Amino acid sequence: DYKSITIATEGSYAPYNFKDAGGKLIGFDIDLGNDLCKRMNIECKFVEQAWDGIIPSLTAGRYDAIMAAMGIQPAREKVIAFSRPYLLTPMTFLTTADSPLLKTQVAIENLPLDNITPEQKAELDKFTKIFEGVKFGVQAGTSHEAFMKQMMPSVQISTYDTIDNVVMDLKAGRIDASLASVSFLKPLTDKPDNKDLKMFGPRMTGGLFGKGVGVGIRKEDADLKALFDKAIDAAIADGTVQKLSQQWFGYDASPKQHH
Ligand SMILES: N=C(N)NCCC[C@H](N[C@H](CCC(=O)O)C(=O)O)C(=O)O
Ligand code: NA
Ligand code: NA
Ligand code: NA
Ligand code: NA
């Protein structure tokens, strides 16, 4: 049943995991991680780890789990295991409030990508054509990068160490647009600080975006995955995930029972 675990997080992806005024790690991932460990009867310790290297540091045994807004993504499933999802959110585009990209008609509001029908492909092709000549920025090593490189290869993309640097460059006009989850973009654009930023386009799920946010765990740690899965099911069931989601995101992005 374990006694103590070390959970890695990035600390540059608000409101999932970031730093407070005193430099302490805070956010939905921290609050949920602490709640889950309390249910598992395990001592919880959060450590900071750069996004670039967070998966090989887990497999190298530098810590026991990852809670860092990490999507349960098929490429990642080849390397590590995941808990069942603790948050579910679609992906959408981001630009500035004065951008002509905002006027683009969205033919498909909710776009599931596990299977891409010709109709869905025509919508993706439309946005690809509109974005040719638009400078995109994404955080390196994300499903956002994977989507742009696989689904929109003709679009110029710049990759960044952190999403904070993406946002800085979008505000400065060094890039024209970005891509991230609604769970990241809604709290970002809700801030009065970011009235100059707007979400737009289809809300996409599945495909290379994966099956929701999960706890990253080594494949051989089957018992640790079982403990997390039981704790997450209980935290969803009693409304804890919904409560924390409302607190950090300003809305309910918690998953539903029976999957
Ligand atoms: N900088 C970080 N600590 N994490 C970046 C994670 C970005 C992305 N996941 C987050 C969380 C939502 C999800 O994957 O279902 C997002 O899309 O906003 C991903 O797994 O590459
Ligand atoms: Na990754
Ligand atoms: Na919204
Ligand atoms: Na409370
Ligand atoms: Na808030």
Numbering used by the authors: 27 to 285
Text of the article:
NocT possesses a typical fold of cluster F within the PBP structural classification.
The two liganded forms adopted a similar closed conformation (RMSD of 0.3 Å for all Cα) while the unliganded form showed an open conformation as commonly reported for the structures of PBPs solved with and without a ligand. The nopaline and pyronopaline bound between the two closed lobes were very well defined in their respective electron density maps. The side chain of this moiety was wedged between two aromatic residues (Trp77 and Tyr39) and pointed toward the opening of the cleft by making seven hydrogen bonds with the side chains of Gln165 and Glu36 and the carbonyl of Ala94. Its carboxyl group made a salt-bridge with the side chain of Arg102 and interacted with both NH of Gly97 and Ser169 while its NH group formed a hydrogen bond with the carbonyl of Ala95. Concerning the α-KG parts of both ligands, their first carboxyl group adopted a different position (shift around 1 Å of the two oxygen atoms), but made similar hydrogen bonds with NocT involving the side chains of Tyr39, His170 and Ser207 as well as the NH of Ser207. An additional bond was observed between the Met117 side chain and the nopaline. By intrinsic protein fluorescence titration, the dissociation constant (KD) values between NocT and nopaline and pyronopaline were 3.7±0.6 and 0.57±0.07 µM respectively. Interestingly, nopaline formed with NocT one more polar protein interactions than pyronopaline.
